[PDB]
């Protein structure tokens, strides 16, 4: 797995791979690591896809009944405190997450939270996530700015999480991105790796090491 | 694996399924389980599979010198004792289980030897994972003076209660005959119960459906004159 | 020590056409090299135009399907006889596995039948209950046997169109439920060839909107 | 596994019965526990297959190579012979054996090995799995200087009440009387011993 | 996480703590402030297990938030550390234990003291001149046994513990990613935005 | 005990002649004859059974030996030594190729293992 | 979690054209020991099912309180318990399943396999099979233990798919079992000679056969049989 | 852990009308990480091809050891080697190590001289021969190879089609499995030419 | 321990040897076996002495409690007070007890109830860990309806064995006789049974 | 010991190392050179157990400068990769394993060409553009995947080396105390003194 999400000028970016393996099986190509809390939050999903997936929607549960009791949007630091209150309570248990909640309000702005199933609450500019963080970090980090457009951080995202796609044995499949606005997320389409790869090495001049 | 022997009136059949496994995978379809360990000494072999085709060749080829040392056909009692002494040398660490069978100027012979060295004599006898399921036919319809036919008959339904039954065996029949004052007469698929059906489409592709980066040719050949 | 879980084998193949689903399994039951039956049912008509089938520990899976059934009979109690819809059965199932999250069902679960527009759908859950709809699924004993050749044959992966080579990919056609019956029939006839576990019989469910019929057809018993 | 030999007026008998047991699986129903070491000395085998078959075949080539240099081994040499092995490789063997000979100037002689390679010279000697239960038996009815028939029903007795208790024993019950006028085998079937 | 420091001179006490958070393999943040405001004039740096940590912290912060509304009032920095110690020696025999150390630097207000306390995990607590928590202590302590004075101004306190710091950075084999700084006095807590 | 016979007993004389080599070949020519002849569709070995009394049974030595299934030999010259070397050729045919190519070896590299046992006699200690 | 103290082996049974054949040795073995020699491991209910029973003797006996229990229960309030509303295999068979399954989820299993034989209203056979896991399946032939390796083989002879059931007599059926069990009694060493068999027939009714031995059996070739290789005498 | 799975890779082996097919993916890796997209798994020694999976320090020394015995073997027999004899030479090879084996699951391919008669083998860790008609998989992918090759196969493929038949068994087993891909090579064998053939295949 | 319970013409009689260890420490050499939960429902004990002296006394309290209530209570009645305790308790118990009782209308019974928690009821039953020893001497020898002194000297006879050949029994051979006459207790010294 | 990097550019190989050099608690050296010269025109840096790493190094080392000196001829670099290869091959069977993974950059002078190659303490050899070994390859080959050329001048790869090492700097939990970058050319090796 590779998860990224970063703070910019335009709000936040969020780029995953697709692909799930167990052991050197690969298990799928086509899993979303983006799960759509509600149409202005989203969460990554690394470790326990279950626990990701059941824990994220049930965020998504506890988000409405706020808004609804108390006639606003939830903050980013509520929402992610109400997930990261529930792993912390289950501590021990087993649970296996490492995820970022993201979000853009009025009076955060766009704000990611790193939240881990040992307790982990962190707020960040940039985050990655997964078996192919590493090789993610190194692009994000040589090639980030807050004045980033909407158009180039996205294309960012999508070749952070090809760097990972191509090295790590346990990422790939396709990208997905997302783009969070105040307004809510935007998506921006499902990459398939096997193209997208040939696409950026001709285009880009880069990947010289392999023949194509 | 399933692997019997059965004596009769005037020799030793053995027999032997065709189906070889790596975990729950079937790695060959029609493997060849009877083993030659000279002409009319013939063996079945379960377990570790290298272990029992290393086993059978050492000894078949120890067994070959013998006989022309001494001038004699070879024994069924000394492919016996080479087999036991070595794998006991071994205590197990070569996992051969045999089902050894064969005629001699002694006369004809059946034998079972496990991988810590130790034998057993028998008129009927039985290896391997479907040994249960053939030892169980076996028990059913074995009686003394079988002839030719009726144990051909009776080892060949105890390896397909084996192939039926036990998922570590399947496929075909091979059976060998060890008749005394005659040839030994391997049957090599000697049943076929188990061929695989017509498929339902042909999934021949159209020339030209693979994507190819570069092409050349290979020098299989030598340095060339001139 | 007491070992709560067991391995029953079987392999179950899931997937989803234009118009109609397919979930397809072996009827073949075992414990290590035993045979406990030859025609044992794996794939079940849960009500609602939904098939089902928890492939692995057939005790879990039995447990499950029992409770699935279960809760479609509640949910027409609970909600004036309305239709499970396939996308509902399938978060209602995420939280019946996830309810056991620290004791789970030891079986990997899929289900098949119609969406609410009336296109097929696939739905594939893991032991503990992360799900998703997907157009293709091979589940149990030979699935790493069949999802590489219905990666090739379905989605028609590493296919390029003759002449272009490698530039143009062969186009994603529909298939008719004849055609993925075909598919669904080789590749249960190529896993029992290949792996010990799979054999005597193949069950195919269809589903439509005229409603859930069965096929079934005879494996090599070896 | 049930075995014994026991001594009488003119030599000595050995009993086992012929069951050989993988786990619960009977490997071999008719199994011969009784092994010939020399002419008039016997032995019957209780542990591994593998040891207690090795160690009687390296026993019989010593003795046959004794024999051919010295003459006929006496009972208590071939006993020596099987401590000797059994002694010095005891953290590799599994191996309870007894030893039974004649000889004309000792007569019937029955020597036990037990696992740890020591030698007891006995009247009589049980052992096996299926022995714990016939301790109390044999010892209530063993008498020594018993005819040939009387040796044989209570060998026949024993081991019937042995294969009776114990799971790992069964099959048959085979005998190897040794005595002056030379080596008898006795068998006797389910349907003999278990009316007993 | 990894290093807490503590130093109390004349007039003040000063808290140095490590900004970096790793997990596992990658360090995910250089930033980070492991410190939470429990009064006016009360400050705890904290360190041990991820989760627990923070959970702690805030859980002490809000009861001795609680505490000043009902009584408005503060809090001595000595009943404070009693609390403290007190939920952490019940935390040992629980369950599943807080695995925490802390520091705690307060100005008491009515002595016109400063007060370095510093407690374990287990509950262990020692008012000390200058304090540590896990490998900080076998670096720096010597050097603290060396230089300190209890009449040390707060300007000569930062002055050895960039001492103390530069002793970490040459011979620990971590990168802690620098540390932030805060001072307690009478006037209440400031941070050092320059260190 | 021990062989103290670590040296060579065959040597170069003045003249370059290795005197053993030399007297062995005179041992061969007055052993009886024996031949070989080669034929396109096969190959003949014969020599005559010289028995040393008429009470022996001749038929018990065998001059013409098997080395393997497709490999014949015959001597002259010694018998006992001839006797020892048909069983090292039997076992190097199985230990240095059988062994490891599954297969008997080829007449000349069977004949090149004999030669170097013959090779090793005529230098060894 | 507990292990098993006194076990009994193999149940085997199969189906026939008119009904169900279940058998099972007498014996209540304590490890290796033989202990005890006249043990029922057939429980029939009613008139219409035979439930054996293999493994731990104790939960054995504790099921066979629980069947006795729950017959009594049925009869209660039930003025057609002994007509349309009396007990089925199935119902017997269903409730036992739901009782193992739940013992082995709170991990405390009976620690069994189950073979519930039995004719149920409409005449139909029904055999079905649950052990310590809840595991549950059907089949032609059904085998517990050591008889799932040695018997059903021999039994599948017989009949070998749903369509040799009504070609299948109760004659030829009783016949394949009773040297079914002659076979485990050669090979299984946790076996006895004594025997029950229960046949449930839709005409017929229950038949339930006592004190069993297996008979004709082969050991006089063992006499040729000599040492382990090379010994003559 | 297990030396069999940290490098990763697959080959696999097929027969066709008068000739045979032998291809491999060019991956090597530590575990999760991609090392290199040109390591090549199939060599050979005159006319007879070898293909080995596994361990690849044990890869690259079992055919440095195959290239030193079988020219030993040319100069002593004055003749190339044939795949009969070749495989029993691998056997012979693999089991001296019995106790302490070569981390590898080698594949013989090729086409005997004289007979003309198309030849392939596998073999496990330890020496046993698998001596299939059909073809023969190996690697950390070869229960998808299995699966593919099942379905896909059909006997007396002629060369160009036999192509086809094994590159996309390769590719799409490959492709479910994360250890296996990064580049592709397939060799088309005929009595007296080959043909090497790099495909293009996603690089994740 | 060895310790038997065997019916006969008039009844039932239990007996046991005496020695309780601690490893090799002979912990008790004149420890009382046998153990009364009613007038004439005795029981004999093996295994844990902590957890057969606990059940016992729950027994006896239960039986006491029945009795108070619905008059004498059978054999068969507190064999299964015993197996409902030994079976519910299974995992934290390790007691081999032998029930045996007269009643009037059913006369002499013996239940044994060993590890699992099962119940057999039998003519007669032998356990403890000198019992295997036994099982051969106790099934030939055993006959129905034997009078009180054939009963004796049979108890007498087989706990001599087991004492003989178990070094876990010994001491004195202790022995409880139930009839319609009433409770009689026996014992039996070394040297007295020693010479048997 | 920790990370070392190669890359091969135009007409030159780089090595870079770091300095590094802990045992367990602290760091006893920050100026450790983990590389030897095997050959005018061959350089090998070596990274693994302590100890294992030095000795095999120098033990090539000899082995090497022994066949320059009995041939008066310096051996290719592939040459020289492969000898050591097999010694590690060899190693790995042994009854105590060399853990010793290493890089050999070479200048090959015949074929006028640099010659990176990556072998691991299996014997596991790969020749590469650019390489690592441990955890260094993680942080450093997706920028090297990008950024690289095969045309590189030797200025340009020092700058997308420097980028590596500030990316390991950064996200690395070790301070690994910066690295000694070597350069192997047709003229031979040199050290660049300024990183
Ligand atoms: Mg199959
Ligand atoms: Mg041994
Ligand atoms: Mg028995
Ligand atoms: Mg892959
Ligand atoms: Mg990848």
Known sequence: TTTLAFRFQGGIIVAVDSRATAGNWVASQTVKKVIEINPFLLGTMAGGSADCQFWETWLGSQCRLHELREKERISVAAASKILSNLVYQYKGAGLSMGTMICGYTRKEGPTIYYVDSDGTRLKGDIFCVGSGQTFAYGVLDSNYKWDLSVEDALYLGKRSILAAAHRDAYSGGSVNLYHVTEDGWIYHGNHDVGELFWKVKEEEGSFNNVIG | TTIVGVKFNNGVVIAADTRSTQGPIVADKNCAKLHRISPKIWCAGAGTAADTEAVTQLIGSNIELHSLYTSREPRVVSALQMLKQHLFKYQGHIGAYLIVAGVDPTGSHLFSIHAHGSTDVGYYLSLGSGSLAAMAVLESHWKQDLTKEEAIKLASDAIQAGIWNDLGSGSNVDVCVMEIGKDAEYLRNYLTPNVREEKQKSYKFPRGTTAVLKESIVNICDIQEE | ?222 | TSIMAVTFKDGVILGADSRTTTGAYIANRVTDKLTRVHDKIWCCRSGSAADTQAIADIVQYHLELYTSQYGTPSTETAASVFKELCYENKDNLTAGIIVAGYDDKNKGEVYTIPLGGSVHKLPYAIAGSGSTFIYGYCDKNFRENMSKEETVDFIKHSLSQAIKWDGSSGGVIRMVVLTAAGVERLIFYPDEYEQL | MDIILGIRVQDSVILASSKAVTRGISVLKDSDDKTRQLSPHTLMSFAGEAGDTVQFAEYIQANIQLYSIREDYELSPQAVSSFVRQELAKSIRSRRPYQVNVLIGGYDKKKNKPELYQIDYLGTKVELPYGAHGYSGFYTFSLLDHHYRPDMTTEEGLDLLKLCVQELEKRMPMDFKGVIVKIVDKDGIRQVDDF | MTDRYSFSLTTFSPSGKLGQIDYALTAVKQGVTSLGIKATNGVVIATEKKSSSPLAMSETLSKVSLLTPDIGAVYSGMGPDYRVLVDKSRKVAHTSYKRIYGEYPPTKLLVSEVAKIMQEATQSG | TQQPIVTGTSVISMKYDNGVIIAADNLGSYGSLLRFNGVERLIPVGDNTVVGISGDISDMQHIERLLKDLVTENAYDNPLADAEEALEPSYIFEYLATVMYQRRSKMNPLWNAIIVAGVQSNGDQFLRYVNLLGVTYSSPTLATGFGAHMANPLLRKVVDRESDIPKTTVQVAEEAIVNAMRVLYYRDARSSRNFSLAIIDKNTGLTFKKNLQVENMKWDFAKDIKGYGTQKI | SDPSSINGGIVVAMTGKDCVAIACDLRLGSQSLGVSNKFEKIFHYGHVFLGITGLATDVTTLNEMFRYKTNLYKLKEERAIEPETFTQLVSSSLYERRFGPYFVGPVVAGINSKSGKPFIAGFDLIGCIDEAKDFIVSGTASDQLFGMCESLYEPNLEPEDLFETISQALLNAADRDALSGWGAVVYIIKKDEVVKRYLKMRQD
Request: charged residues 25%; hydrophobic residues 35%; proline residues 3%.
């Open chain 3, 1 to 222: 020590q007491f070992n709560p879980y067991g391995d029953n084998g079987g392999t179950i193949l899931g997937i989803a056409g234009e118009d109609f689903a397919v979930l397809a399994g072996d009827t073949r039951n075992i414990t290590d090299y035993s045979i406990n039956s030859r025609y044992e049912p794996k794939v079940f008509d849960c009500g609602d135009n939904i098939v089902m089938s928890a492939n692995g520990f057939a005790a879990d899976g039995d447990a499950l399907v029992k409770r699935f059934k279960n809760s479609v009979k509640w949910y027409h109690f609970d909600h004036n006889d309305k239709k499970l819809s396939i996308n509902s059965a399938a978060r209602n199932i995420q939280h019946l596995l996830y309810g056991k999250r620290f004791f789970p069902y030891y079986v990997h679960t899929i289900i098949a039948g119609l969406d609410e527009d009336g296109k097929g759908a696939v739905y594939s859950f893991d032991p503990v209950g992360s799900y998703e709809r997907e157009q293709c699924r091979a589940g149990g004993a030979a699935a790493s046997l069949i999802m590489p050749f219905l990666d090739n044959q379905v989605n028609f992966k590493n296919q390029y169109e003759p002449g272009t080579n490698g530039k143009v990919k062969k186009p994603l056609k529909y298939l008719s439920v004849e055609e993925v019956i075909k598919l669904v029939r080789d590749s249960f006839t190529s896993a029992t060839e290949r792996h010990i576990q799979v054999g005597d019989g193949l069950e195919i469910l269809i589903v439509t909107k005229d409603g859930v019929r069965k096929e079934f057809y005879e494996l090599k018993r070896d």
